[PDB]
């Protein structure tokens, strides 16, 4: 069913996350963590205090798909995730580490979200946006509901953290 999923997304905020490679999304799925650059880290920390749920929707650059979505369970904290960093991306260049609970680990191709435009990015298709781009509530909710159901996930424990 979709009822607990809809409850988790109620009055949520949504942010597009762009990962340079698949390895870091795989690590995030395995370890329940994410890190971003300080400009986006500040935005997510503000949002985490401000909303019942902050949802990160992940897309690997050039993949043509989203790889799933997750809910922040903490603000960022410091003090060492073995991110696969491209040349020019330093471990210190990143911010802290956010803990996340995956809501859906399944893929969604961009072809299936072509009817969804993001008011906060000039009504461009929701697939379009820089890392950290906020997605307006209605568009973000509909995008999350397009993903295939992930039957491996039990949202009972996530609801209790709200
Ligand atoms: O360098 S990434 O593969 N992608 C990225 N987007 C914006 C800054 N970095 C990475 C993902 C997670 C830790 S490091």
């Amino acid at each position: 069913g979709t009822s607990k999923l809809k409850y988790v997304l109620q009055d949520a905020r949504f942010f597009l996350i762009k990962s340079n490679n698949h390895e870091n999304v795989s690590l995030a799925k395995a370890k329940g963590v994410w890190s971003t650059l300080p400009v986006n880290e500040k935005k997510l920390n503000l949002a985490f205090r401000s909303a019942r749920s902050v949802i990160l929707i992940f897309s690997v650059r050039e993949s043509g798909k989203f790889q799933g979505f997750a809910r922040l369970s903490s603000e960022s904290h410091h003090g060492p995730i073995h991110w696969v960093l491209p040349a020019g991306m330093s471990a210190k260049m990143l911010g802290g580490v956010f803990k996340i609970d995956w809501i859906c680990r399944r893929e969604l191709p961009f072809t299936k979200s072509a009817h969804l435009t993001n008011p906060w990015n000039e009504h461009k298709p929701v697939k379009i946006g820089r890392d950290g781009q906020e997605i307006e509530l209605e568009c973000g909710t509909q995008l999350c509901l397009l993903f295939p159901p992930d039957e491996s996930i039990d949202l009972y424990q996530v609801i209790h953290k709200m």
Side-chain angles (χ1 to χ4, degrees), residues 18-21 24 34-35 61 83 85-86 89 94 131:
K18 290 282 163 87
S19 173
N20 277 69
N21 57 58
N24 292 333
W34 192 246
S35 307
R61 290 186 202 283
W83 301 116
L85 304 170
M89 188 79 50
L94 288 158
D131 183 55

Side-chain angles (χ1 to χ4, degrees), residues 35-47:
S35 307
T36 190
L37 297 178
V39 51
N40 283 336
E41 174 187 22
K42 292 181 183 75
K43 282 169 48 171
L44 293 180
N45 281 332
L46 277 167

Side-chain angles (χ1 to χ4, degrees), residues 60-61 63-79:
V60 176
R61 290 186 202 283
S63 71
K65 305 175 180 176
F66 303 97
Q67 284 72 33
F69 60 97
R71 183 188 174 277
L72 291 188
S73 68
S74 78
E75 295 180 17
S76 68
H77 291 103
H78 299 253

Side-chain angles (χ1 to χ4, degrees), residues 14-16 57 118 120 126 133-137 139-140 143:
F14 302 88
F15 295 86
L16 186 62
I57 308 177
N118 182 3
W120 299 153
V126 65
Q133 167 73 55
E134 191 166 357
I135 305 165
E136 179 271 330
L137 165 71
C139 176
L143 175 54

Side-chain angles (χ1 to χ4, degrees), residues 3-30 32-51 53-61 63-89 91 94-98 100-111 113-129 131-135:
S3 295
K4 285 200 290 294
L5 173 55
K6 286 183 262 170
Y7 187 83
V8 170
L9 300 181
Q10 267 276 308
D11 300 298
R13 298 178 67 177
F14 302 88
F15 295 86
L16 186 62
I17 295 299
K18 290 282 163 87
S19 173
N20 277 69
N21 57 58
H22 278 285
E23 280 71 25
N24 292 333
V25 170
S26 168
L27 203 164
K29 287 175 172 177
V33 295
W34 192 246
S35 307
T36 190
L37 297 178
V39 51
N40 283 336
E41 174 187 22
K42 292 181 183 75
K43 282 169 48 171
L44 293 180
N45 281 332
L46 277 167
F48 179 81
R49 314 156 182 146
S50 94
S53 285
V54 178
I55 304 300
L56 306 190
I57 308 177
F58 288 83
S59 177
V60 176
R61 290 186 202 283
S63 71
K65 305 175 180 176
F66 303 97
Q67 284 72 33
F69 60 97
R71 183 188 174 277
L72 291 188
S73 68
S74 78
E75 295 180 17
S76 68
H77 291 103
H78 299 253
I81 301 157
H82 276 64
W83 301 116
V84 171
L85 304 170
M89 188 79 50
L94 288 158
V97 173
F98 294 88
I100 61 181
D101 292 309
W102 285 88
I103 302 171
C104 175
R105 291 190 176 80
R106 311 270 312 265
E107 276 172 22
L108 181 78
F110 288 167
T111 55
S113 65
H115 61 292
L116 297 179
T117 58
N118 182 3
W120 299 153
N121 196 24
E122 307 185 345
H123 276 281
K124 291 168 181 192
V126 65
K127 68 172 178 180
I128 302 299
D131 183 55
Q133 167 73 55
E134 191 166 357
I135 305 165

